[PDB]
Design a protein around this ligand. Structure first.
Ligand SMILES: C[C@H](NC(=O)c1nc(Cl)c2ccccc2c1O)C(=O)O
Ligand SMILES: [Fe+2]
Length: 221
């Protein structure tokens, strides 16, 4: 799909109605696999952090750590396909501007590449931007081939506001997900029992970000 067709025929109407939108087979197998290879290279060469401290025990030798991250600009050697993903995300958002709510997106974060190492850790229920920091849309790309949650866990569970039933999303290879970053979309990552990779960028609303600068006295493109 041309980015503009995906944007106009799906992302815009989907976001305005549900605020959570899934695009499968975003970039295709070849490109997805090359992204996977770049992320695994980052992992194998020690570019991720050691992981979120989950359980801090009296003895530090068996401390439990969870999600590992690394921040990627997209131009680094060995990260050019990641950069290409980011550009593709940006192109989609561009074609959506003026149509995602009343927001006006004028920048984004660098990419946060996350690895849940497969040791039964997940991520607690949270809101990405609960305090008005400028971020209006979360965009995440999943890289996990033949991921089977029945077996490997790692489901994203989102709980929209005032709705009784949550939504479970598998972190499937070449899946792109958009959702509003604010309190409309509390979510969590259920425990993962296999290595689980994803890449997130957050898009900023111009007005919210401009006045966040005041109240809190890292944005590109
Ligand atoms: C979408 C979900 N991930 C998150 O909700 C998620 N959210 C935040 Cl705010 C994270 C922050 C630091 C490191 C990993 C994070 C993280 O992973 C997922 O991976 O499916
Ligand atoms: Fe999150």
């Amino acid at each position: 799909l041309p980015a503009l067709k995906l944007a106009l025929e799906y992302i815009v109407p989907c976001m305005n109605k549900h605020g959570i939108c899934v695009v499968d087979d975003f970039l295709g197998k070849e490109t997805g696999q090359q992204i996977g290879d770049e992320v695994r290279a980052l992992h194998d060469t020690g570019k991720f952090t050691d992981g979120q401290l989950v359980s801090q025990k009296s003895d530090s030798s068996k401390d439990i750590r969870g999600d590992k991250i690394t921040w990627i600009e997209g131009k680094e050697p060995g990260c050019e396909t990641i950069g290409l993903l980011m550009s593709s995300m940006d192109d989609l958002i561009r074609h959506c501007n003026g149509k995602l709510g009343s927001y006006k997106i004028n920048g984004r974060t660098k990419a946060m590449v996350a690895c849940y190492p497969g040791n039964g850790t997940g991520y607690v229920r949270h809101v990405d931007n609960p305090n008005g920091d400028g971020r209006c849309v979360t965009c995440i790309y999943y890289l996990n081939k033949d991921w089977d949650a029945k077996v490997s866990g790692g489901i994203l569970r989102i709980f929209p506001e005032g709705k009784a039933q949550f939504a479970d999303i598998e972190p499937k290879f070449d899946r792109l997900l958009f959702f509003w970053s604010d309190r409309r979309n509390p979510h969590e990552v259920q425990p993962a029992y296999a290595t689980r990779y994803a890449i997130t960028v957050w898009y900023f609303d111009a007005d919210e970000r401009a006045r966040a600068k005041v109240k809190y006295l890292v944005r590109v493109e």
